[model samples]
Target: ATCANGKTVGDASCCAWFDVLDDIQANMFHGGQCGAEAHESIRLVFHDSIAISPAMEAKGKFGGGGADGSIMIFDTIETAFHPNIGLDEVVAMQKPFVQKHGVTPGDFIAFAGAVALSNCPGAPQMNFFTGRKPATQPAPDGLVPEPFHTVDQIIARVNDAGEFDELELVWMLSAHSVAAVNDVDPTVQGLPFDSTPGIFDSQFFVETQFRGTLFPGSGGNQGEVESGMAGEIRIQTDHTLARDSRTACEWQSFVGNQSKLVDDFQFIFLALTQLGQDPNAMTDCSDVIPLSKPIPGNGPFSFFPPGKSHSDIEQACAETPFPSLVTLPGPATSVARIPPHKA
Candidate 1:
């Protein structure tokens, strides 16, 4: 188990870390559905945590600058650093927790991510780390891979996020499996990454793997392949990684087996959230890692082939791993839909 059986930020479990968990749950599903909200929250924490890593490892010096939740407090500037759309509301979801609990930005950012993961059923429990001081200003620009880019460019950004190489990029992008897209049509939002958006599973691999074959955006002619299916929304990161000879197989291997993703996500998620914090900063708290649980049902999510449960969607890939060779639509002329920038 990568997570401690239980945890603490101080000397007791009475710290109301569960209250923080409660806050995340209440707000996570509030805006629309948990799928979009969770994906945005997941994106928010990733950017915030990953931002300071570049600074931490600059010039082989263990630079003191590290994860401190500045992104949440100063998001007006930080969100613009790259392409963090829909995340303004995500940190807004955690802002109240910071005010109500008097928690630091770093603590709020770290705990929110762990709780977000727990919000999904079958997801693993994550450990909590305390005492991260919040940053008073924004992180440096270009910390994370921005929302828009070619496959190769996107890979460079995360690879540059820290020492994390190409392989873990696959692990980190498992987060994409749950994401929802609002940028496609500024007038219309809530496009899902996979056929089923509500559940956090291995659909990212299955969908991207299947789509990789038909889509021309693997490395070239992206403009021609962007909007062929009005229903499908494939982003640069998933598109690029799934087709690249380097990452494609690992992406495809996750199709039928959900457990592999769960385990990899558990370890990677923990390692990511705790990357910069002092290993000894934890306090003994009861219920520090509370169970937020998944939304009751998939709840009218975005586009899909039709008739599928969250599990059913994963099973779709299993039923026919090779859908490309079957009934298929020819490529489209409109470029793949990228997310729209928020005002």
Candidate 2:
């Protein structure tokens, strides 16, 4: 969601794993402790941050478009060889939380939202609830459907996950309402959900009606497909829920009240943003915290520090060699870049 970097901070956090690869190379001679320690520190800090900002929310908000295009492409190819990409780290970290709290469908949705907003500093912070019980059994691999899968496949997958129908799926897409995608792969890129990526709105649905706009490029193949049908966008689980006989009733209900869809999606999305912690996880004035606040400082970290300002700590860190124990990545290297789409 942070346009300056062309990637969501949540996604950025996942990408941060690669830093370990770099550390391994650099520490080959220095007893390996520095690198290992650094990696551990990074992981710890990331875990704590994720505790505050779950990656699922981030992934949900930023996945499937220009915001996460680089990562998606990278993972698709990398997983083939490594089979343990960002997802592995995510599961490893989330398992403990799920074990303690238990996984609710709402929690899953909220977690995805957190990942999506990881890049956007101004994105709203939702209340979190903990104590979700993790599934005693592991979910099937590849639970998420492919972007290009048919409507029937999409419906079957979502149903298998226990969602009611296509309505929830469309509501889920509202996360995209505030994101952007590349206008033309490398040539144009930015928040693909809307021209106003910074603000959350319902324009994503309005824009979907047009061709070669925010999505559904000039080729007129912008959205999902229903059953075997093709179109720029197909919101009803590839159109299977909307078209197939079995799901027709559910699909009709979703399309019957477009206004209700907007309102309900907005409400549910806002609610889902809060997952895995208590409802009061973020106290009042929490949103005012600067995006760059150090995770753990020289002293005990407080979400609300009395009287002290962020700038003061920043200056204090700058003045000392033994800076506060905030973990930050070294300078970033551009792995890939995309341009904003043209209307």
Candidate 3:
């Protein structure tokens, strides 16, 4: 049978995804606005997939389940992992559709991520495939790194997962352009990672490079770093990655290069989605994912966030001079929380 997305599947049941897409885009994501739920969905894909560790398996360890939706299917076990604190709520948000759409959690979790990113402007169109079997066991613990983890620690763990390199790690971290930190402080409910958190742009690359001036939240956590703006939070991991000798250049390359950022992000994130799946066994359902929109309201088009200056940027890439960008003219602006999801 052919789906409304123009892809044909051997089983007519696969076509149910089109309806799933509509309901999620409209209801779950609130007409594709880049909200908290959208951020949660993208993060869910990472938590669900970033569990592969071939080296661990060689030592007879449980090595991890990659992209199998174990986090959603076995939420009680997987969500309790230290790095997975907030994900149980994300799973709760997505759980009802499992029975409603009759789709496997693995496919739905991955596709929900693709659809969520597509809603953000400047995000690249990601591919999606279907026909994944359900989770056999919970993903092993300690595979997911925390925000306080050192650069070397992150690189080592990620390399164990499909041999990803420092550059690809930069690609994956670019998603934080649209991400937030809710648990960094008890008072700060949803502190964004960058100045412009709602749009999936290179703002994170630029903002994280800024010299941190203040803590956006009242009290800092192990994962928190001082932020450049009043209402933004920086993960210590992101802060270190921007300055680390091996990854800084790659992380800084996205500073103002929106096109390259999205392109690289799309390529690497696609590899992330395929972490433990057999490509030959699944059918491409990329056509089911929608196109991303342009920066909303035509954009202000400045490289720097409002009320920042050239000297504010702490250039880490010694290879090249930091690109001179126009800072928006205004009093300093603090990022606002993404509006709450529909009740």
Candidate 4:
């Protein structure tokens, strides 16, 4: 019996969901349109799981936040309240699988994210569990971090949600590697934080440190100078995270090492995904991590190894061969940000 490994094979329910996960990933596979959807799938987990607004905090023990798929229905409400935007496409990419698998919104949302990371070479498998019950209302607003907040502000928000350290913040910022800012400069959508916006690499840490310059602005209005050896966007958070001493070294360390990124990301992502969930009620998918990093073959697909050429601008942006992405025809098509719902 094929039992044990990749978090499936043994239990019948596990195998069934794994199969469902596979079908979902197929639709979210790499490409321009789909890449954004896939990348945002990862965002959905982080946004959905980490939450505890100012108003909610006053609720004492039951502040209505943490790991409960509130962001799915609530993004419309929370979009005004937090930096939660561009998630509608992820919803579109995932709804079919949820319908097909009969998966709960919470389970399907987090699992879709973990499966999305599997497509990216250096990311490890995130923790997957099945007990989350989807929320009918929005999460308390202002719980998620914004691109324009101070390190102190960001960490304070994170701390209130759960236990988080500067290192966790640094790693958490890596999510910027796959994201874009359309709300800031609505005229220009899909502005990326790194040179290669389409794939996952440690390059985000590298690019954030080296490529961009701080420009005038504050809050969400802040934008970094386009150092497009790749794309044209950076935000307030990128600058502060790279320059601050607490995270700068950790950020620099991730630059050349793919394995390091995957290893830490694997551990941290599981922790991030499990926020607010009762440990007693969940089964750990710890053994479910991806087994390998990207192969360093003689293709642009290979990332630059560190302690090598630091000045080679060409190597920084070169990532996987831009293969012709399969357009599945039904993936959500839009550049609109999710507008905040009027209270």
Candidate 5:
């Protein structure tokens, strides 16, 4: 598989070097829930490692606060933080694949994983795949766009990354539907349990239509300021996609069909989440077992044995593959420890 920056590596030896780094991030952080006692310590280690890396440092300075902060560290952390609670879980979940694919985790997968983890814990287990080979070198410095970027800029970056079209952009961002923006600033803070904060739904698109606050503060040239703090809590690079003319038409399309946008986004997201994997190594569409079959109960949730094939699950959803529970797992249990998917 390609590196986080999207570079392709032809050799296993080169991929191995990057794989080690990715493994470190995943192993150290996986299952490390938000606000957990170990959160800060692991975060600091990952942050420091990325901050000190020549590739990351060259992109920009670290911890500069809002907009001017280092893109590498900011984007990397952001990818894992929002939906999944923290980067630790994200990095940890990707470990098995990184080892198998010989590739480091990419920001996209982390972001996708975060969304799945938040809304559909069972789905994410089925979504992650193995065999993504790492690149010999880090991805291009400016690939991840800033959150505050204009519509045009957001379009340009995603297009350049070959995620072309507004459909892809909207669908991808819809992954954020199940997430919440922390009320870091008292003056403009939002509640944590606000209606759609932690549920997977079409609210993000609907809310984006109305005036709502965004986290991290916006600064990029995305477009007309609709309402609520449009410029709040955005990554500096998000501006690039928001402002690019090439992607303007697509952006307009997204603003038009918010619900349809969410549906398509979920579909594509599930597809991409499992894009680079050796199906034999993990579950896939063809091997997933139907949930109707009896399985041992593991705590409040029923446990699907490991080594189940994706094919077994291909028709599982046709007969109600998902669990009835929407709330996160209890304190002692987590999505990480459970088998990859149990829908």
Candidate 6:
């Protein structure tokens, strides 16, 4: 259980991860703080894993390599995919470390996601694995979902990839709790999904349900939706999913419930990280990743975040009267972009 770096792992199989963890802590995450790099690294795991198409598989084609790191290994081709336009930044940042650490691109990308999530306060400890083989072929294009995609199209894509249901897809999108938009507009970049951009809390679930008031970027983008706040951006897909009959209830269930949200997110994310590999073939290295930093003033699960009245809520799911939450007293709130990490 001892690592080459003089640390101990839960199992000898996880020893090599210590060095990868060190590099991620020092370089990738900038001393374990979840900045844009960590955010992008977290997104990288999804982009790498969820590109499969069962329809193509049925036709006896390449289909796609699920969770096999084809996006990072075959950057030249995969980066050009429409859904992956800005992902080259993270892929470029991570490619060197994969070679430096000498691990499969699949393992590095997935491990990077776990480490990145651990840095975000309120995120659950995620499962990690090793021994993913290199991708045999680049994943075919047009599989990853785009912001402009319809809710029905998004659901079909998820179902085709892993036979996952609508609830699981809603849970997976909770990753947006710590996500932002950089490609929607070059001039007005880094618009966050929710008011709290740095913390991995359920604010995104509560906020995305609010009525859209403004656009955080240029209105020219294909999938841009009017945001609930001045400095926020809503993807057209996310906006519709929050209101869709099939997905609305599950999406609203996370409101003010950080514990259940993160728990479900961890489960679906693990399913994602193991997509193409045999569940029994990989070694468990979950213990090697550190716990998430606790969010400051973490408490009181408000129905309204701050600076707003009850009327602001659009109330998508009628399952319950949207758990009555205390709204902080103040002027209307505006979200800020996630800051850059120290290089």
Give stretches of model 1 more than 4 Å off: 1-14, 27-33, 53-66, 150-152, 212-230, 283-287, 291-343
Compute each candidate's TM-score over C-alphas: 0.72, 0.36, 0.94, 0.75, 0.41, 0.96
**Candidate numbers sorted by TM-score from highest down:** 6, 3, 4, 1, 5, 2
Candidate 5, residues 1-343, lDDT tens digits: the string is: 4545454454323333344434433443343222221222222222212212233335673312111112222445444433223334434444445346533344323322432232232222223233333322322333444344456665555444334466576556644433433322333322221123333443333233222233323323333232222222332222233333443233334332444554565466544433323336432321111111111234323212232222222121132232222232333211111111111
In model 6, which regions exceed 4 Å deviation? 4-6, 339-343
TM-score of 3: 0.94
Model 5 alpha-carbon drift over 4 Å, by segment? 1-126, 182-194, 212-263, 270-343
TM-score of 6: 0.96
Better of 4 and 6 by lDDT: 6
- What lDDT is reached at residue 63 by model 6? 84
Question: How many backbone collisions does model 4 have?
Answer: 0
Instruction: Please report how far candidate 5 places residue 141 from its true position, in Å.
Output: 1.8
- Which is the better candidate, 1 or 6, if ranked by TM-score? 6
Overall local distance difference test of candidate 1 = 0.58
List residue ranges in candidate 3 displaced over 4 A.
1-14, 297-302, 339-343
Highest lDDT against the true fold, candidate: 6
Q: Which has the greatest TM-score?
A: 6
lDDT of 3: 0.84
Q: Report lDDT (CA) for all predictions.
A: 0.58, 0.32, 0.84, 0.59, 0.33, 0.86
In angstroms, give how far residue 96 of model 2 lies from its true place. Answer: 15
Error of 3 at 83 (Å): 0.4
RMSD of each: 7.4, 19.8, 2.1, 8.8, 15.0, 1.6
